Symmetry: D2
């Protein structure tokens, strides 16, 4: 029951709801002053530019960004890079922070209790298909090929599923499907992740990407908001409820994935822990990145900040600066040091005689003279002092900064401010 | 201690901070779903477009909007009509809602406790002169003539004062000055407002417009934030502390007021109660408004929403529609009815045989056939039913809707929904 | 060749080219200082906002505006209302005026000689389907349903045809089709318009809307640009050449027309003479307009100018102002006069005791006291003096102003400045 | 007449007119497809971003850009980087190309015959002080210190003069002043530039920056447009006319220059010939640039294009890429080559084994494998083939490309297309 012009009308009758929401507690000290969607990525992006540029390029120009925890950077970023819309053309990016009225009320008890507080505003949009996007994730998806796959099957809810290794399948929503892609068994974040049939080493996992018949969502949240034992969550409460009525279908992600190399596998990185954040950025620095960002058929929109060109200058001794598989964004000033496998964001000043290897330097970092950096993540505005050594003595990096179990170091201003180093340059 | 070009450099060394903040509890039900700065005004404005367009036309392009209570409409309005800035030219409108973490903290204890939570962000602006604007007020001021008076007097704090009648001086900050415009005695919201010398019928009142030496403000809040018995307010705690050191000067508003008729008195309306809101809008509908809005030397910037022309059509009987001293904004459709002394905002539909007199019809109102309206304020999206009569029986309007002591009626959806009228259009 | 998602990919592979181009000599004095696409219409629109908002809502966000004659107002209008695009998202409105060098060259010899001068720029867009839009016309078309019909018939060129009366078929490119919508006989602006089969009173006319295979267009212009006897026009030279090879199909306009009343006929006004301009605007003033402009599923984008509400005030004698089936846009100030069947654009000042009937008052017009206006078009910024009478003596309106054969008067500043009246208010 | 607030009101009463105008014939082939104001500079700027960002930061937000020769790139640049204005706040960038009506009229005969053709539009702005800016020049000037010095002296015209070497003074307007900065003798482009008193090696030259009383300008052009012996130029016709009446004063540029190092001399480069274009860009690459572009108190606004970070990758052999005193803007991809004293603009692709020394690589250049480049300017989109050698054999670089007398090479697509190299990558 699909018309030949159906692929262009369904995005125009649809509304996306990005659950920027809370944080990732697994990113110890990267998030303490920001939400996980506002974590920097890619030299110039934040994570929420991925869950927003896929709505645009999918025709969905009606988004709803639900923000609760440390949203000042997020909201300022939406204001400055996602406020080119005109509300007359049926397009907007509405911010829906919890409405504060009394002393301390209305704080969004859950993921599914944030779309129910704002259920008097979303009704006004008059949307038939509600995409429910987790916007703390990194991907390149076309939701006008998932909306169709939702409309062909005659479904009421449509969960985007993609297989992942059973080792990491205890952190996502594992399901089980049939020949018609109907969800039979759904369980959220199990302790013993069930495997797929014919693939014992992999589990069919939910990505946090639900498409909903709007008439069904509203009747499902109002029918769940009165539940006293509910935890108010899509995975932990609702999707089991839809599944047990047999109204929940599964949409494979490889179908609706935008990738420039069809021979490759789909790219999904959720930046769960610190190690996967670091590994995810340097993938862009390699020679053949898994994530294409020089792609013009699916571009990513962000805050086009005005920065001068990246300047490389001679050190105090007149010598050269060497580079190898690195990204140097605008504003940077690298005074003749060695930079390898690194990602430097905007306005990173790197003075002389430094050595930087497999590092990620978030913006406005100042590296002092004669510093050695190996396998680290330097947070925003960190003023590294002269002669600092990082990533060569694991026993001396665990008791100064934070050091993951896999060997990744994280540097913040508070970590440096606690050792006496002044961070007011 | 002045200079030739000083009048142009100080707005650029300056930063404004709009305390959009809380509400006006004296605006009974007009605010229950919005902040007082987001109350509509003038057919197309909100109140915070006055405290923001005086920063632009005074050269202050660095503003800081502090929003706590019901800011969804406010933040959406700033997003859509005040997001044309480019952060590279040293200009921005930063939104500073209270940072929420752990799900119940940081709720801004006071007016002066909202500039102390955000005192790590405002330092980054590197501003010498901090203008502190109450943005729930209506005026036309030039803060590049108040900054000079502050920079021409050697002041540390400079309170904009204007005289008001002693009857209404119990709701503002009454002060007392000397021959050099030095504040001698300041008391906040007295029960017996002291009169001026030589003018027993009027009191010298603070408008809520403080200009501050930045070096003094940061040292004054951090010296006040540690106080456990303080109420955390500019008027109630800080301005007496500055006054008692003799570092607080007074800047008369008639000097820095922008008015097209120099023979007139300065215009200040803080839309305190309901009655002054109604009286303030209809002042624009009279023949000679006290507030000039057809002024091109000091224009007011707002959300230029795309609306069709105001349409006047014949009623069901083919008859004419009469108008008398009224404002009809864009989108409106008036089907042959009588409109007098009224202000119709955007998208107001007025069906046949209506009679509307001294009314204010906030946006998206639908008036049904054969309605009579007198001395009323119809709130957003109210769907008035057919044959409703308002403003002719005071005993029958007080038990349906809200009716002030002076005779002004207010109509909301909740008031109409409670009488059985369906508000689903 | 009709794939599930073909309806959404073809607009992105497409590029529109608006031939704003020359003028309408049949608009005697309305155009003398502007291009016909920049003629005002609708109270707030210009004609080129129709050929541009149909590209946006059809997904075609890459437009090319070819401007030659008096484009100052046009270019300024595109600059201020059509410059919200970001070139990184594959979207833009490129202005392509003739490139002037040596002070006397490159002046666009024809309609199809304007897309050949800019053919070193349009190749860079890398477009497969080139829509060729005449943008001096008024309609509501969906070019993502003409593009489908173009890709599902296997066509190389596809001319949008609609039947019109044989009495107005001498100014269009009349064709003749077959059962498969293949153009058999095309002749451009005949003296005896051939009729349709079974409809002797109507002719199947070209609207000026060609969709082209881009690989065919470039090879057709370069194969025509070398022709010495060609007139360099799409109708007079190219479309006959395509037709005579049998590669030209016809797309009926009723299929790809957006109208809110399916029972109605498609709306197409070329605003040819003066009489159809006047008649076209007042259709919006009637009770049931043929053109829906309160439509939210196909809105029209324009210069959203910041204007105050429409003010109606009492005249010198304290009397009422009456209105009947009229449009009053923003900025207007009507001092107690009678306005009937009229359309007032922005900033129209109408002083006391006026009588205005079936008029169109283009922007910034000042009507003086005691003026009577009937069946007229008042041009931009015309300062009508006190006691002027228009539309009651045809013999006295033909020797002052311009008066069409049908009774429509046109008033310009030059017509009024020639009678001695000062036009410098 | 030095009023307290005069420094802030005069920019708002003022209007700037950038004579983007014609070309520099002295830039042999750099300009053949663009105007000299649209020549690229600085890695991301064009020259007219200098004559435009000084109006913004000087408070002048009403600009008028007069464009005649090859303005497609210029106009597109203003459209995309200088169209953030709102005409309601009294601010705009009006483009004023010559009006074409019949078939080859209205071709700006001179510099001063372009402000006379557009004299019906500039009267509408209602400006008292008309700044006349040559926008083919590079500087950092504050015109709110030049407008004041014009108003203190009680002048009618105020020519910004700065001393330059007598060797290059035959290309500017040499004048002679008195103790009160009154112009005594003005002569335009002499063959023997007269020297200054006490500085025989230097001449007091006009920069092309005239401030005018508007009531005098309109009366001077209309009194000059009717002259049959006039050449219609500010220098060659008008400024002698003002000087011979004694109404022309001189404003030294060092007063109103914005420079971060007060010990330095003012920076003025007219980018005359090819050699001063190359030398002007590489000045930004040195360690201490003469032009500060990391200045936040006087930033330069431009088309903030969305480009990915600058990527450095390993060559085919796995080796390092070295850099020394170079600028690499965004989009670039340098595959392990040596870059010295260079300036790479956006989207410059540099394949392996290249050697680049004192080069300027304008955008979208592709350098092939094993290329050596020395003292060259590679124009837009040049696709350099594999193994090309430039700047090592002057006799072999003069008969291929263009080579100045000083040794600077210029490479264009037409120069490469004529040697057989395909330039369609
Ligand atoms: N230059 C800076 N110095 C110190 N903190 C900053 C700076 N810029 C931003 N921040 C803060 O760093 C935190 C993270 O911001 P961001 O890295 O932009 O998400 C927020 O608390 C910001 O206010
Ligand atoms: N058309 C409408 N119908 C019902 N409520 C509305 C409508 N438009 C806005 N609102 C709500 O009215 C309240 C006040 O919004 P505002 O009048 O824009 O300050 C908010 O809760 C809005 O979400
Ligand atoms: N207020 C005005 N008074 C006189 N001429 C105007 C005014 N506004 C625009 N024009 C001119 O009227 C012509 C048509 O402009 P437009 O009506 O905008 O297409 C152009 O030559 C404009 O410069
Ligand atoms: N990628 C490209 N390939 C060939 N020509 C181009 C390219 N980009 C711009 N041009 C042309 O180069 C000339 C100069 O443009 P610009 O360098 O932008 O001033 C104009 O004719 C442009 O249309």
């Amino acid at each position: 029951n699909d018309h030949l012009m159906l692929a262009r009308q369904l995005p125009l009758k649809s509304v996306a709801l990005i659950l920027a929401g809370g944080r990732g507690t697994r990113l110890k000290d990267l998030t303490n002053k920001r939400a996980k969607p506002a974590v920097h990525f890619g030299g110039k992006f934040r994570i929420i530019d991925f869950a927003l540029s896929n709505c645009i390029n999918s025709g969905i120009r009606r988004m709803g960004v639900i923000t609760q925890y440390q949203s000042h950077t997020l909201v300022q970023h939406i204001q400055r890079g996602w406020s080119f819309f005109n509300e007359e053309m049926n397009e907007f990016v509405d911010l829906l922070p919890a409405q504060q009225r009394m002393k301390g009320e209305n704080w969004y008890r859950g993921t599914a209790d944030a779309v129910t507080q704002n259920l008097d505003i979303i009704r006004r949009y008059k949307a038939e298909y509600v995409v429910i996007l987790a916007g703390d994730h990194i991907y390149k998806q076309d939701y006008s090929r998932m909306l169709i796959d939702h409309v062909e099957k005659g479904a009421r809810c449509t969960v985007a599923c993609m297989p992942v290794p059973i080792e990491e399948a205890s952190a996502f929503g594992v399901m089980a499907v049939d020949e018609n892609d109907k969800i039979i068994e759904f369980v959220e974040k199990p302790a013993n992740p069930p495997s797929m049939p014919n693939d014992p080493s992999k589990s069919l996992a939910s990505m946090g990407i639900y498409v909903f018949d709007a008439d069904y969502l509203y009747e499902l949240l109002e029918e769940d908001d009165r539940d006293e034992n509910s935890s108010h969550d899509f995975g932990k409460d609702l999707i089991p409820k839809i599944t047990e009525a047999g109204l929940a279908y599964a949409h494979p992600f490889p179908l609706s994935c935008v990738q420039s190399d069809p021979d490759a596998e789909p790219y999904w990185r959720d930046v769960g822990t610190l190690e996967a954040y670091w590994k995810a950025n340097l993938d862009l620095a390699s020679v053949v990145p898994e994530l294409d960002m020089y792609d013009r058929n699916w571009p990513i929109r962000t805050y086009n900040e005005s920065l001068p060109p990246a300047k490389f200058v001679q050190d105090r001794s007149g010598s050269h600066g060497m580079t190898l598989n690195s990204l140097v964004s605008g504003g940077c000033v690298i005074s003749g040091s060695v930079v390898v496998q690194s990602v430097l964001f905007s306005r990173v000043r790197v003075n002389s005689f430094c050595n930087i290897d497999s590092a990620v330097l978030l913006p406005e970092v100042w590296v002092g003279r004669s510093c050695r950096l190996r396998r680290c993540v330097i947070d925003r505005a960190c003023v590294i002092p002269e002669g600092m050594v990082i990533g060569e003595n694991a026993e001396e990096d665990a008791r100064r900064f934070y050091r993951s179990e896999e060997g990744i170091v994280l540097v913040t201003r508070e970590m440096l401010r606690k050792l006496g180093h002044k961070q007011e340059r």
